[PDB]
Amino acid sequence: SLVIPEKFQHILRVLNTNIDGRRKIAFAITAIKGVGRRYAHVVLRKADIDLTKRAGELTEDEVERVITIMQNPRQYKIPDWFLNRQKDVKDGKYSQVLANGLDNKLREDLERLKKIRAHRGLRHFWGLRVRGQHTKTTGRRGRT
Amino acid sequence: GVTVKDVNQQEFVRALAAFLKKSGKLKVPEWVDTVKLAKHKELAPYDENWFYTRAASTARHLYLRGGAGVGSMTKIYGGRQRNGVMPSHFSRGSKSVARRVLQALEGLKMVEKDQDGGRKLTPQGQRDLDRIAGQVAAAKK
Amino acid sequence: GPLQSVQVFGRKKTATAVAHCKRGNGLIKVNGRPLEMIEPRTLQYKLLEPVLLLGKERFAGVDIRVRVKGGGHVAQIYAIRQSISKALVAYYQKYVDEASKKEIKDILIQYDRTLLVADPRRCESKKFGGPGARARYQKSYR
Amino acid sequence: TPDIKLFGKWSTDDVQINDISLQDYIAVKEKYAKYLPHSAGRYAAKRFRKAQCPIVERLTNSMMMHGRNNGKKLMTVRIVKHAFEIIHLLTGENPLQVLVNAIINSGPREDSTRIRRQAVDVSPLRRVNQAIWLLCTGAREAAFRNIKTIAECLADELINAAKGSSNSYAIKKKDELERVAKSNR
Amino acid sequence: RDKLNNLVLFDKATYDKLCKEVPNYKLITPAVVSERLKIRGSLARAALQELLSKGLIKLVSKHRAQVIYTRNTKG
Amino acid sequence: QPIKLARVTKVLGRTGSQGQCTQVRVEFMDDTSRSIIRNVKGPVREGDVLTLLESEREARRL
Amino acid sequence: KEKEEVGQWLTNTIDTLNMQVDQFESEVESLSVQTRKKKGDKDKQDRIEGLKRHIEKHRYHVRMLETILRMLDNDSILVDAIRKIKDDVEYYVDSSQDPDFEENEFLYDDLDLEDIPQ
RNA sequence: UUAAUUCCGAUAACGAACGAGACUCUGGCAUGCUAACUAGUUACGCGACCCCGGUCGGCGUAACUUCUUAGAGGGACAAGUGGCGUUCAGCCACCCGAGAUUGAGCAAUAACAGGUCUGUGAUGCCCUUAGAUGUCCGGGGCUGCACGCGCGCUACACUGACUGGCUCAGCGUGUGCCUACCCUACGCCGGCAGGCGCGGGUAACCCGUUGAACCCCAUUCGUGAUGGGGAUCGGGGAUUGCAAUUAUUCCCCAUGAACGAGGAAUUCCCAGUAAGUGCGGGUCAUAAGCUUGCGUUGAUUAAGUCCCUGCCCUUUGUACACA
Numbered sequence A: 001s002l003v004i005p006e007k008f009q010h011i012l013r014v015l016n017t018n019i020d021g022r023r024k025i026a027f028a029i030t031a032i033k034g035v036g037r038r039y040a041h042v043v044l045r046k047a048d049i050d051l052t053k054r055a056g057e058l059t060e061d062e063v064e065r066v067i068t069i070m071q072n073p074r075q076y077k078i079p080d081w082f083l084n085r086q087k088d089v090k091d092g093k094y095s096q097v098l099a100n101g102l103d104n105k106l107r108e109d110l111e112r113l114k115k116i117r118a119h120r121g122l123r124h125f126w127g128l129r130v131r132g133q134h135t136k137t138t139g140r141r142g143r144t
Numbered sequence B: 001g002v003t004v005k006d007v008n009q010q011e012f013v014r015a016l017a018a019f020l021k022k023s024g025k026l027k028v029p030e031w032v033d034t035v036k037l038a039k040h041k042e043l044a045p046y047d048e049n050w051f052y053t054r055a056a057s058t059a060r061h062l063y064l065r066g067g068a069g070v071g072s073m074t075k076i077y078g079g080r081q082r083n084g085v086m087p088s089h090f091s092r093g094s095k096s097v098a099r100r101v102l103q104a105l106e107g108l109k110m111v112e113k114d115q116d117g118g119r120k121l122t123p124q125g126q127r128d129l130d131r132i133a134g135q136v137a138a139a140k141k
Numbered sequence C: 001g002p003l004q005s006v007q008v009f010g011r012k013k014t015a016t017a018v019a020h021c022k023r024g025n026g027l028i029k030v031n032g033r034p035l036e037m038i039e040p041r042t043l044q045y046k047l048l049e050p051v052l053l054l055g056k057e058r059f060a061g062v063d064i065r066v067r068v069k070g071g072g073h074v075a076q077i078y079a080i081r082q083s084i085s086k087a088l089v090a091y092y093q094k095y096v097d098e099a100s101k102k103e104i105k106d107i108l109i110q111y112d113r114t115l116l117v118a119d120p121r122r123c124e125s126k127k128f129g130g131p132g133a134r135a136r137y138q139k140s141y142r
Numbered sequence D: 001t002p003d004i005k006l007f008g009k010w011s012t013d014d015v016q017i018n019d020i021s022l023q024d025y026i027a028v029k030e031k032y033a034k035y036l037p038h039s040a041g042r043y044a045a046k047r048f049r050k051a052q053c054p055i056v057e058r059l060t061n062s063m064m065m066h067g068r069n070n071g072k073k074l075m076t077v078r079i080v081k082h083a084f085e086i087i088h089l090l091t092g093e094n095p096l097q098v099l100v101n102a103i104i105n106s107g108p109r110e111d112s113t114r115i116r117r118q119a120v121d122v123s124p125l126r127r128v129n130q131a132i133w134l135l136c137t138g139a140r141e142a143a144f145r146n147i148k149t150i151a152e153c154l155a156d157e158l159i160n161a162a163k164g165s166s167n168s169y170a171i172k173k174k175d176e177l178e179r180v181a182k183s184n185r
Numbered sequence E: 001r002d003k004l005n006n007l008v009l010f011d012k013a014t015y016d017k018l019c020k021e022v023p024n025y026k027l028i029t030p031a032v033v034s035e036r037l038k039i040r041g042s043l044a045r046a047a048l049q050e051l052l053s054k055g056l057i058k059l060v061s062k063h064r065a066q067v068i069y070t071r072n073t074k075g
Numbered sequence F: 001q002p003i004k005l006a007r008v009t010k011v012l013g014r015t016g017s018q019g020q021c022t023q024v025r026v027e028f029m030d031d032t033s034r035s036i037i038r039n040v041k042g043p044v045r046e047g048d049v050l051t052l053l054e055s056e057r058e059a060r061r062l
Numbered sequence G: 001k002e003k004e005e006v007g008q009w010l011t012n013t014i015d016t017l018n019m020q021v022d023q024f025e026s027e028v029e030s031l032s033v034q035t036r037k038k039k040g041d042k043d044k045q046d047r048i049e050g051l052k053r054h055i056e057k058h059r060y061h062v063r064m065l066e067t068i069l070r071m072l073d074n075d076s077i078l079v080d081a082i083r084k085i086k087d088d089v090e091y092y093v094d095s096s097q098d099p100d101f102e103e104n105e106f107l108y109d110d111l112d113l114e115d116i117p118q
Numbered sequence H: 001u002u003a004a005u006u007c008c009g010a011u012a013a014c015g016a017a018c019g020a021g022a023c024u025c026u027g028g029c030a031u032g033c034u035a036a037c038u039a040g041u042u043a044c045g046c047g048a049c050c051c052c053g054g055u056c057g058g059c060g061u062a063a064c065u066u067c068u069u070a071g072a073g074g075g076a077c078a079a080g081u082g083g084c085g086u087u088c089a090g091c092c093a094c095c096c097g098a099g100a101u102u103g104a105g106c107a108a109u110a111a112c113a114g115g116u117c118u119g120u121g122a123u124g125c126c127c128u129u130a131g132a133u134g135u136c137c138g139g140g141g142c143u144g145c146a147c148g149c150g151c152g153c154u155a156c157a158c159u160g161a162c163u164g165g166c167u168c169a170g171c172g173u174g175u176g177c178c179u180a181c182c183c184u185a186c187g188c189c190g191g192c193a194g195g196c197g198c199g200g201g202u203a204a205c206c207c208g209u210u211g212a213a214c215c216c217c218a219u220u221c222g223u224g225a226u227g228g229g230g231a232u233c234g235g236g237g238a239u240u241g242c243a244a245u246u247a248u249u250c251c252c253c254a255u256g257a258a259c260g261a262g263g264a265a266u267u268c269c270c271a272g273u274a275a276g277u278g279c280g281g282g283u284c285a286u287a288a289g290c291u292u293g294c295g296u297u298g299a300u301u302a303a304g305u306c307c308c309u310g311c312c313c314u315u316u317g318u319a320c321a322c323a
Ligand SMILES: [Mg+2]
Pocket: H113
């Protein structure tokens, strides 16, 4: 399969994001902000896809199989502790949160922390370190 | 003529996993395609059949040093925990994959539970590993 | 039948190796494994230096079973090689003619002196004020 | 063979030191034949004992540099082992001999010091030291941030120094060093 | 600033280049094969595997960091 | 201009600002009666052969 | 900048003559296989001799290009002379494999490079 | 002349005292001694596997102390040889050999407005002493953040990263007068941190043959801020704690910043040294980016000088003497 056949695509378009076709698929679908180096491997093992195959080398019949497992992992036997959003503060729903949904959920966590005037929300507003860090000496680029 | 000791262990593990494949009863778990087998890792084991090689390694280590339990296996399959911004340390393997390799390898009668605990190799398990040593020794000719 | 064992030790560092050389056939093996598979294998000919310098017919009448404890892989290999080269040495003082022993010394020492006498270099103690044995911490001014 | 000692797979004979200024400072021949470039050591106990050190032991000793590679003589023995096979394949001739030729061709014969500078000539020992050092860091900055291996860079750098091709860092720093020694004598 | 576009699979304009000249190289390594043919090192290793299986090149030594091949022995 | 070869017959002392050079008497290997003085950089013991790229440049004493 | 560009071009030429030496050596290799398996390939031995002519002159050209690069980094030989001979050396690299070959004998006699020993 | 106010020698000095040296510990060496069921080795018997032999930290007892332990001794003295030397004090090289310069500890006189009243029921004086500067409880701060500096850790990758396999240490510490808090084998549930059960160990006895990391062998990568790097940040899960929010710590997923080897300048170091690499101890309810030890792998260069910064001695000059 080292010959370049038909159906090679240099840039893929899943979850309204690009994919480098040069990469192995197990690191190529990490380009979706929401899917990382290891959630890529668990999705590409729940579907029978050989990991030495490249993103451009894949055909259309299996890229939809990849992103449907991305969209709903609990329907495809992925356990609950891979997910970046379980026990949500609004619907209590276990899900994996993806490309623009990740910015949406991060922003709603931020503003839901802002509205109650929590300390972490106020430090996120002012731009300081929110996890209790010593801001006296380091972090010289978030400030000035 | 040949033992497990007097043959190179590198291909010996790689061929004994194939013997455990040909047995066809090695009892892989349900999460074997999803997990990381140690704390000091960040990526899943790339081999689809890493459980068979791990069982081969465990059988070989039980041959070479018996009386070994789950804490001993996590001591054997330990590595450097890269703590990121902090320096690296020593971390162990996964107790569940260790105990399920042992429970599989006593599900098919190749290891045995020692009195008070620990795992020892059965005599026919020694025979199995020694014939796998014989096959990889005939592979040197 | 005279039992003709000799049991010697050899060192490089905290690793020490005991070679058990007795009357038999041409067997040489360390920790139960033969000498051609002891890790790391880039020092395979380092392990084989007593064998390849002294040939095989000197090894023909004796078998040697070596255990080694302590240290690490390179110090392990040097203690093993030490133990072999002085195991044939202490067998051939004891059981055969002394002049075969003398010409074996004429092979081993004039190749390398660390086959039969260990180097006395051991780890020097770390002292206070520094990260190690001789080095010290960074001195800061102003 | 009991008489001749192969350096793994290279004979230590058929290597002729074309210079006599480095003939008693390049240890290759007739008592210094060893199987490996890994010995125990005690070569820095006295002042001139590193002359007794065989030149491939010194080549592996000077190749373990830049901090992350300190204590890795087994790895540098393996790099030099692969580099010698690449050299023998590229030239059809003895890697030990073109290593000796690279030493002789790269060793800078005169230097400049401060007694505004003043020119001096070099020790045979310092000439061999500077030769090995320039060859090793020519391999190092050939292999840094690059796809090709340190074994390949050491191999082609030794071959380029054995011909004086001015593509080797050792030659193109030797000639400038002798040039600035020429400038202030 | 600087960037290389290394081929990740051979196209037909490079496959003939490989299978024509590369078995005639005195030094054959995936590194130098990448440097001549502007390909990746992984693609070069996958190339030299089938070239060794078809016997157009000859393995001399292998390591996990350095594998070297050459031309066919004459005989 | 031929380059010449010369054997050290004597080491005289360390010279330089930091004492980094040796000052040796060299006897040429063409004429065994021609011995001049050169300052030499590096560890030089007596009995050793040096390649002089300039050979008639005599070195100042100590 | 100009000296660096010219020396870089000389490095590319020693690379391409190394490659073409490898090509002619491998054709010598395979025709030598054929002659040793079946003696009687006199035409193949003659082709080996013609390829050996090509290898010999490519080696000579490598040695003079190496002399040029040495003397150029030592700043002794002038870049105007190297630009005087760059067109003819390019012509050699382009036309060495052709039967129609009109080579300059005076490539390095224009600079007295064969006159000066190594 | 020496590392030395170390000696020879000279001598208005003679005889001495401290420091130096000697000294104690530590390292290296003993197949000679003492001895070993809390250390073993070798034999022999039995068991297991293979094809008479091989392996076995599988089980057991007749010798022995090589390996181990730690005691008594021995050992090395510039002793031997050849030069250099007032043929002195001594220096260089070499033989023989484990060692021909192992590393520390202790460390004189005189001092310094050096630090410590926040080590003390060591302590003078002063302040305060019931609306307390005593003491206790609750909460907060010592972590606060435009900037500057110091000690450090991680890195900027292919001499690498990831993933499998293989294979080796040495110091230790461990169930507590108060005092609760130990080290853990092993069985089972759990991806994981963890949890639920029975056991050993007050320790050469159990953890433990401390299966440590680096290194070594095999995969995937491919010069791309990339699978380098892992900061920042979001969601969830466990442990300790009376209580964790300004996230105690640990995990899981996701986010994937600067950083392409660092200006002027500047630190430490020469043989098991630097450097890499992990493991102990202290701190510790939870606990190492620190420190103190330990090993493991193991060099480049140097056997020199007074150029720089300082130190010692003599002579010399001085308007300096809190110099
Ligand atoms: Mg004061």
